[PDB]
C-alpha cells in the first residue's frame, strides 16, 4: 500500500513525494480520493529527492499540499472483453452511462508495447468492408489505418455505424469507438443514435464499445483516451482472435492534447508550437494498430486538417501512418449518392495488382479513368449540349452515369431512417458486377436500376420491376 504526499500543485501538474525506493515508475497511475470520487494522476517525471511530476486526469481544484496519494502499482488500467460492449467509459475505465460497474473479467494497462518486428504480419491484406465504393476503389488494409475525411452533412455516423455492423457480421469482430476531444453534445448524440440504429442494444447483444474523452477534460485525459480505447480493442484481437475496428474521432485532437501536455510540463515547443515528441507520440499509438498472428486491429480515424494545410506537422505526421483514406463529400451527397464517398478522391495503398489481384485492379482502374474523363466533360456538356459527343465518348458518359449510381448502397443500419432494406455486398460480387458493366453487358438497362442496390442480381431484378 504505497503512499505519497502532494507537494506541489500548478494547474493540471502535480508533484508528489515518496519514501526512498518506493517511487512509482514513470507512467504509473496514482490516486487521490476526492468527495467527487477519485482523482487519477499519471507519473511523468522523477525530479530528484524522491519527488515525481505528474499530469492530472481531472481537475485539481481543491487539492492541498500534503494530501495522501496511493500508488496503483502500474499504468492506468481499463476493463476489457465482451462486458465493455454497449457501455460508456472515460479515460480511467470508469463507467459513465450510470449503468452500474463494468464487471469485466480483467483490467489491462493502457500503455503497452506494440507487437515486435517478429510478430508483424508479412503480407498486407484487404479488410472486406461490405460497402461497395470502398471495397472496389479504396479497399481497407486489414491491420491498417484509414483516415475518414469530411465532417457534418455527409452521413458520417451512419458510415461508421455500418462499418461496425458489416464487420461484426462478416468477420464476427467488435468495434471500439473512442471520442478524443469530441463535443459532449455530440457524444450524447452518437450514443442515442447507436441505440436507435441497433449497434448498441442495451438489452440484447451489442456490437461496439464507447470510450469518451471530452474537450472539457484536462490535456492529460485527452492525450490518453485513445490509448484506453485501443487497449479495449487490443484484447478482442489478442484473446478473441477477432478482426477489430477502432474508431478514433478525432485524431487531430489527440495531437493537440499531446501538444498541450508537453507545454505544461515545460518542454521547449518544436516547430509551429507542436511538442518535440509529436512523431514518437504518434508512433506510440499508431504502432499498436496492426496485424498479429492472432488477428488485427483496424482503425478508422477522423482526420482534421488545420487551415487545410496538409504540411502542418499535425496532418503530415498523421498521414505517414495512413494506409488508405475514405473521403465523404457534400458534392457526392447533393447528387443523391449514399454513402457520399468520393470515388476519385478516396485512395488506397492496397489498390495494387499485387495485393488485390489483377482482376480487381483492372476493374477499379478503368472505373476511375471513366469517371475522370467524365468529369472534364461536365464543362462542355453544359455548353455544347450532348449531341456533340464522339463514338467512344457518348457511350462512356452514359455508362459512367450508371457506374456513378452503382457505387451507392443502402445501409442496414439506416433502414430505420429509410425503409429500404440493407445489402452487404461481397468483394467477389463487387469486382465481378463492375467488370460486367464496364464491358457493355448492361448498357441497355436504364440508370435507376443501378441506384441504391446490392450485388449485380439486384440490378437485373430492379430493372424488371421498372417494367411492371
Amino acid at each position: 500500500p504505497i503512499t505519497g504526499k502532494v507537494t506541489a500543485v500548478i494547474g493540471a501538474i502535480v508533484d508528489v513525494h515518496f519514501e526512498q525506493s518506493e517511487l512509482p515508475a514513470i507512467l504509473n497511475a496514482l490516486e487521490i480520493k476526492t468527495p467527487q470520487g477519485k482523482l487519477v494522476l499519471e507519473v511523468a517525471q522523477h525530479l530528484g529527492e524522491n519527488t515525481v511530476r505528474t499530469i492530472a486526469m481531472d481537475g485539481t481544484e481543491g487539492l492541498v499540499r500534503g494530501e495522501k496519494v496511493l500508488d496503483t502499482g502500474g499504468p492506468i488500467s481499463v476493463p476489457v472483453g465482451r462486458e465493455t460492449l454497449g457501455r460508456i467509459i472515460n479515460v480511467i475505465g470508469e463507467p459513465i452511462d450510470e449503468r452500474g460497474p463494468i464487471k469485466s473479467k480483467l483490467r489491462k494497462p493502457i500503455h503497452a508495447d506494440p507487437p515486435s518486428f517478429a510478430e508483424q504480419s508479412t503480407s498486407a491484406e484487404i479488410l472486406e468492408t461490405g460497402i461497395k465504393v470502398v471495397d472496389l476503389l479504396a479497399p481497407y488494409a486489414r491491420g491498417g489505418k484509414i483516415g475518414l475525411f469530411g465532417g457534418a452533412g455527409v452521413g458520417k455516423t451512419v458510415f461508421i455505424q455500418e462499418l461496425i455492423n458489416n464487420i461484426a457480421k462478416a468477420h464476427g469482430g467488435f468495434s471500439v469507438f473512442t471520442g478524443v476531444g469530441e463535443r459532449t453534445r455530440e457524444g450524447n448524440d452518437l450514443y442515442r443514435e447507436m441505440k436507435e440504429t441497433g449497434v448498441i442494444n442495451l438489452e440484447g447483444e451489442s456490437k461496439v464499445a464507447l470510450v469518451f474523452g471530452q474537450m472539457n477534460e484536462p490535456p492529460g485525459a485527452r492525450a490518453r483516451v485513445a490509448l484506453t480505447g485501443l487497449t479495449i480493442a487490443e484484447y478482442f484481437r489478442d484473446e478473441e482472435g477477432q478482426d477489430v475496428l477502432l474508431f478514433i474521432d478525432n485524431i487531430f485532437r489527440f495531437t493537440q492534447a499531446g501538444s498541450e501536455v508537453s507545454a505544461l510540463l515545460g518542454r521547449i515547443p518544436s516547430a509551429f508550437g507542436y511538442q518535440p515528441t509529436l512523431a514518437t507520440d504518434m508512433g506510440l499509438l499508431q504502432e499498436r494498430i496492426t496485424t498479429t498472428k492472432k488477428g488485427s486491429v483496424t482503425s478508422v480515424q477522423a482526420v482534421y486538417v488545420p487551415a487545410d494545410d496538409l504540411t502542418d506537422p499535425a496532418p503530415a505526421t498523421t498521414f505517414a501512418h495512413l494506409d488508405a483514406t475514405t473521403v465523404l463529400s457534400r458534392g457526392i451527397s447533393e447528387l443523391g449518392i449514399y454513402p457520399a464517398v468520393d470515388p476519385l478522391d478516396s485512395k488506397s495503398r492496397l489498390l495494387d495488382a499485387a495485393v488485390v489481384g489483377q482482376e480487381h485492379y483492372d476493374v477499379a482502374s478503368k472505373v476511375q479513368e471513366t469517371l475522370q474523363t467524365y468529369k472534364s466533360l461536365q464543362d462542355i456538356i453544359a455548353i455544347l449540349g450532348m449531341d456533340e459527343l464522339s463514338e467512344q465518348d457518348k457511350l462512356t458518359v452514359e455508362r459512367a452515369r450508371k457506374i456513378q449510381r452503382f457505387l451507392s448502397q443502402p445501409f442496414a443500419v439506416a433502414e430505420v431512417f429509410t425503409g429500404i432494406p440493407g445489402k452487404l455486398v461481397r468483394l467477389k460480387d463487387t469486382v465481378a458486377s463492375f467488370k460486367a458493366v464496364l464491358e457493355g453487358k448492361y448498357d441497355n438497362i436504364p440508370e435507376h436500376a443501378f441506384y441504391m442496390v446490392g450485388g449485380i442480381e439486384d440490378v437485373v431484378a430492379k430493372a424488371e420491376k421498372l417494367a411492371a
Binding site: 507537494t7 506541489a8 500543485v9 500548478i10 494547474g11 493540471a12 508533484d15 467527487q36 481537475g59 485539481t60 481544484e61 481543491g62 487539492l63 492541498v64 499540499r65 500534503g66 460508456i88 459513465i96 452511462d97 450510470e98 457534418a152 463535443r183 459532449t184 453534445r185 457524444g187 450524447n188 448524440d189 450514443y191 442515442r192 469518451f212 471530452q214 474537450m215 472539457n216 484536462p218 490535456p219 493537440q256 501538444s259 498541450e260 501536455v261 508537453s262 507545454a263 505544461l264 510540463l265 515545460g266 518542454r267 515547443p269 509551429f272 508550437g273 488545420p306 487551415a307
Partner: protein, 482 residues
C-alpha cells in the same frame, strides 16, 4: 500559526508569493492585511503563488495573509435579475445587496454524456439573416466572430432584446433569461449598454457580469466562469438562459497575463498550454439537460475578435473548434450596407434546422440554396448573360436586401416567414431594389390590418399547413399587385 495564515515573501505585478498557508486549497480565495483578496493558483514546495484581485500597492513584504476556506464562488439565483455585478457577484449598479438562493463555485463540471438531450428548441434571435440561415437552439454554443467594429455585440444584444416576447408571459418553458458578460470593455461601454437594455425594458430579465478594462486580470479571467454559474442556476432548475461572453479574446488575454507573471511555460503566442482547456471547461457547460434532470438549458454566444479575419490565430482556432458554429461578420459587407454583416458562406449552425421553427425551415430551406448559388455566379453582376444566370442574380440581390435589418428591431417569427416566403418564391423580382425596404415595412403592416388570422396561426402552430402556404400566397400576390 502558518496553516491558516501566511507571510508575504515578495510582491509585484499582481502576484504575491507567500510563505505558509500550509492547509490552503488549490484556487482558494485568500485575504491580505490591507483588505485586498486574491486566489491561490500556484501551490509550490516552499511557497504559494497568489494572484491579486486588487492593486498591489495594497500588499507589502511580510504582510499577513489569511485562508478563507472556500474555493472562489459566486451568489446565484433570481435575486440577480436586473442587477449588474462584478466578477465575484458584488453588485455595482448602486441598487443594494444581492439576495442569493445559494452560492456556487466558479469552476464546475459540465453535464456529462448522459444528462443531455439533443438540441431541439429555437433560441429566437429575431434577426432574419440568422434565424433563417444560422439557427441557434437552446443548449447550443454559437460563436459570434469577426474583426473590430463589425456588429458582434449588436447580434447578441438584438437577440437579448428579442426575448421580450416570451419573458412577458407566464409560460416559463418559453422564457429565456439573459446573462451578458462584459470582459475587458471600458466601463462607460458597459454603462451605455445597460442604459440601452433599460430603454428597451430588457434589463428586467438580464444579468450583467462586468469585469472591465482596468480590473485585475484574475477578475477578467474569472468573470466568464462566475457568470456561467449564475446562468447555470437557471439551467439547473428547469429553466433556460442565454449567456453572452463578450469577449473570449480578452479573457484569453488576462489568463495569459496571469500565467506569464506566475512564470508558467509559454507556448504559441505566449498562451499557456492549457488555454484551450480554459475555454472548453467554460463552453461545454452550455447544455440542454435531459428530461430526468429538469430539461433546463444554457445557451452560449461567445464573442471572439479576429485580427484581419485571421481565424487561424491561436484563440480563434480553439474557440471555433470548441463551439457548434460561427456567425461570421465582415467589415466589407458592412460598408456595402449588408447589416448584419453576416457572411453566409462562412457561417454555420452545426445543430441547424432542428433548432429552427418548422415554419421558417419550410420557406427558408431553399433560401440556404439560392444565396449559395448567388455567390458562385456573383462576379457576373458587372451584361451579356443567360436567362438562367440573371434570374439567379435578380433573386439573390433581393434576398440579400430582405435580410438587411436595423439595429434594436428584431422581428417575430410570424413576421419573418411571410417576408421570406415572399423573397424565396419570386414575389419580389418585380420590385426595384431601392424599395425592398419600404416594401417589408408596408407588407407587414398590411398583413397586420387584413390577415391577422395567419400571422396568429404561424405564431401559434409554428408550422405551415398546405392551406396556409396557399393563404400566404394569396395575401402576398394581393399585396404585390397593389
Amino acid at each position: 500559526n502558518l496553516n491558516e495564515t501566511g507571510r508575504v515573501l515578495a510582491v509585484g505585478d499582481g502576484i504575491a508569493r507567500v510563505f505558509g498557508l500550509n492547509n490552503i486549497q488549490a484556487e482558494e480565495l485568500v485575504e491580505f492585511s490591507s483588505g485586498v483578496k486574491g486566489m491561490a493558483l500556484n501551490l509550490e514546495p516552499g511557497q504559494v503563488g497568489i494572484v491579486l484581485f486588487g492593486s498591489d500597492r495594497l500588499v507589502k513584504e511580510g504582510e499577513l495573509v489569511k485562508r478563507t476556506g472556500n474555493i472562489v464562488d459566486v451568489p446565484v439565483g433570481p435575486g440577480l435579475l436586473g442587477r449588474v455585478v462584478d466578477a465575484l457577484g458584488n453588485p455595482i449598479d448602486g441598487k443594494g445587496p444581492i439576495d442569493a438562493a445559494g452560492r456556487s463555485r466558479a469552476q464546475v463540471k459540465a453535464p456529462g454524456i448522459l444528462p443531455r438531450r439533443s438540441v431541439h428548441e429555437p433560441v429566437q434571435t429575431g434577426l432574419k439573416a440568422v434565424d433563417a440561415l444560422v439557427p441557434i437552439g437552446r443548449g447550443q454554443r454559437e460563436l459570434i466572430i469577426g474583426d473590430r467594429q463589425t456588429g458582434k455585440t449588436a447580434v447578441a444584444l438584438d437577440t437579448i432584446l428579442n426575448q421580450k416576447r416570451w419573458n412577458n408571459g407566464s409560460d416559463e418553458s418559453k422564457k429565456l433569461y439573459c446573462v451578458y458578460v462584459a470582459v475587458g470593455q471600458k466601463r462607460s461601454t458597459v454603462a451605455q449598454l445597460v442604459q440601452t437594455l433599460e430603454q428597451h425594458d430588457a434589463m428586467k430579465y438580464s444579468i450583467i457580469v462586468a469585469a472591465t478594462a482596468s480590473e485585475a486580470a484574475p477578475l477578467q479571467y474569472l468573470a466568464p466562469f462566475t457568470a456561467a454559474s449564475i446562468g447555470e442556476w437557471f439551467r439547473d432548475n428547469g429553466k433556460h438562459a442565454l449567456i453572452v461572453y463578450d469577449d473570449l479574446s480578452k479573457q484569453a488575454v488576462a489568463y495569459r497575463q496571469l500565467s506569464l507573471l506566475l512564470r508558467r511555460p509559454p507556448g504559441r503566442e505566449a498562451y499557456p498550454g492549457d488555454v484551450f482547456y480554459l475555454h472548453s471547461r467554460l463552453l461545454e457547460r452550455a447544455a440542454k439537460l435531459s428530461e430526468k434532470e429538469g430539461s433546463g438549458s444554457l445557451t452560449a454566444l461567445p464573442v471572439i475578435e479576429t485580427q484581419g479575419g485571421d481565424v487561424s490565430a491561436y484563440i480563434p482556432t480553439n474557440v471555433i473548434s470548441i463551439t457548434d458554429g460561427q456567425i461570421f461578420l465582415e467589415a466589407e459587407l458592412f460598408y456595402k450596407g449588408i447589416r448584419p454583416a453576416i457572411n453566409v458562406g462562412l457561417s454555420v449552425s452545426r445543430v441547424g434546422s432542428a433548432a429552427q421553427v418548422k415554419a421558417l425551415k419550410q420557406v427558408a430551406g431553399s433560401l440556404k440554396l439560392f444565396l449559395a448559388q448567388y455567390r458562385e455566379v456573383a462576379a457576373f453582376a458587372q451584361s451579356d448573360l443567360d436567362a438562367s444566370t440573371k434570374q439567379t442574380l435578380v433573386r439573390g440581390e433581393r434576398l440579400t436586401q430582405l435580410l438587411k435589418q436595423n439595429q434594436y428591431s428584431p422581428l417575430a417569427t410570424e413576421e419573418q416567414v411571410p417576408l421570406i416566403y415572399a423573397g424565396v418564391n419570386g414575389h419580389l423580382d418585380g420590385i426595384e431594389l431601392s424599395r425592398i425596404g419600404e416594401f417589408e415595412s408596408s407588407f407587414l403592416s398590411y398583413l397586420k390590418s387584413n390577415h391577422n388570422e395567419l400571422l396568429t396561426e404561424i405564431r401559434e402552430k409554428g408550422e405551415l399547413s398546405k392551406e396556409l402556404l396557399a393563404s400566404l400566397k394569396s395575401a402576398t400576390e394581393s399585396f404585390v399587385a397593389t
